[PDB]
Amino acid sequence: PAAAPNGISLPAGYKDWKMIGVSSRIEQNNLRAILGNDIAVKAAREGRTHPWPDGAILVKLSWKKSTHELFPSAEVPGDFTQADFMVKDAAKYASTGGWGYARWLGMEQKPYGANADFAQECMGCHSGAKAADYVFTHPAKLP
Amino acid sequence: PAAAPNGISLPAGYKDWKMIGVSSRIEQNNLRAILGNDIAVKAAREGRTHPWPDGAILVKLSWKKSTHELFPSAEVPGDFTQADFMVKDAAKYASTGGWGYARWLGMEQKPYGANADFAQECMGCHSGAKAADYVFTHPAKLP
Ligand code: HEC
Ligand code: HEC
């Protein structure tokens, strides 16, 4: 796939990354999985998030909600909508809270954003999570 | 952790397994992640699910739904409730449709079931998916 408008390349093999958590957004009618590279997953599990370490990459994968034919009360993934990424580099991405933001749309992997300044949209909401280093997700608890 | 009543041991390192899908069960008020070992993940991605191959292991992880303090419309994991497993061995588990079923409850990982016949409960529902080799989950679509 083409790079994002700010120059960020799509991380190869993100579909093999370990699970950090899951979510459902009522207003978007979607289901989401949150995965990370090994630096991200080690930080998540030890609570090294004030701040997240350089080299951590988070991905969020979104699907439209659909219902299971044999069990209609189970909400399950339908069409794939987007892959959203945050790349930690405190020096390189100082103007956007130390994070490099990027999104690719659909099974076609089309890069999102009108121009190289697109990540200001992402900051509009993610600045609300400034006390948690711009990340909303609380890693899911496991034994 | 202690073994299940049918003698199945808790699969070690399941939290490091690759993602097959996600779900939300309305009547249970939860969120779930579906992971698998590398035998199951190969079979899922290649469509080799008639039947699933011997050695495939599927896990479902469940959390109570909670809402994000900074974004109330985001439904997110709360307390960890259970880990559910299905281990494919067509010969060994021929009496339960070719799958070895087991559940461990909570952060303490307490084995579920009154006695060695507990998996007949699981079969009561999972026999509804008998045409799909007793598995409801459709692997989530990714590029
Ligand atoms: C989840 C997200 C993630 C995971 C990291 C995190 O902060 O939890 C990424 C990589 C990402 N987003 Fe953002 N996003 C928002 C909220 C509330 C959540 C948590 C709940 C859930 O699982 O859905 C997010 C909020 C918003 C938002 C407010 C309307 C906007 C405009 C955005 N996000 C925008 C972006 C991006 C701009 C292209 C981008 C690359 C994001 N998010 C990455
Ligand atoms: C999901 C499940 C999985 C993953 C494999 C699959 O079939 O998709 C495992 C390892 C497992 N269960 Fe079962 N379960 C049910 C349904 C509808 C789904 C798909 C939707 C979702 O993601 O939630 C399941 C249904 C039922 C059910 C009907 C009320 C019962 C009684 C059970 N499941 C019982 C069990 C087990 C008995 C202890 C067990 C080990 C299960 N499920 C494993």
Residue numbers in the entry:
A (entry chain A), B (entry chain B): 19 to 161
What do the authors of the reporting publication say about this deposited model?
In M. capsulatus (Bath), two related β-sheet proteins (31% sequence identity) have been previously identified, a cytochrome P460 (McP460) and a cytochrome c′ (McCP-β)5,6 encoded by the CytL and CytS genes respectively. Cytochromes P460, defined by an unusual porphyrin-Lys cross link at the 13′ meso carbon, catalyse the oxidation of hydroxylamine (NH2OH) to form N2O under anaerobic conditions. In contrast, cyts cp-β (the only known cytochromes c′ with a β-sheet fold) lack this crosslink and appears to be optimized for binding non-polar molecules (including NO and CO) without enzymatic conversion. High resolution crystal structures reveal a highly similar tertiary structure between the two proteins but major structural differences around the heme pocket consistent with a switch of function between hydroxylamine oxidation (P460) and NO binding/sequestration (cyt cp-β).
The crystal structure of as-isolated (ferric) McP460 was determined to 1.36 Å resolution with residues 19 to 161 observed in the electron density maps. McP460 exists as a homodimer, with each monomer consisting of a twisted five-stranded antiparallel β-sheet, two α-helices and two helical turns, Fig. 1A – a protein fold similar to that of NeP460 12 and NsALP460 13 from AOB. The defining P460 covalent cross-link is evident between Lys 78 and the 13′-meso carbon of the McP460 porphyrin ring. No hydroxyl modification of the porphyrin (observed at the 5′-meso carbon position in NeP460, but not in NsALP460) is evident in our McP460 structure. The proximal pocket of McP460 is also quite similar to that of NeP460 and NsALP460, a minor difference being that the His 144 ligand of McP460 is H-bonded to the Tyr 119 peptide carbonyl, whereas the His ligands of NeP460 and NsALP460 are H-bonded to a Met carbonyl. The distal water ligand in McP460 is 3.1/3.2 Å from residue Asp 102, and we note that a bound hydroxylamine substrate displacing the distal water would likely be in hydrogen-bonding distance to several additional pocket residues such as Arg 43, Arg 50, Asp 102 or Arg 121. By contrast, our structure of McP460 clearly shows a 6c Fe(iii) heme resting state, similar to that of the HAO P460 cofactor. McP460 has a significantly more hydrophilic pocket, which may allow water ingress and aid in denaturation.
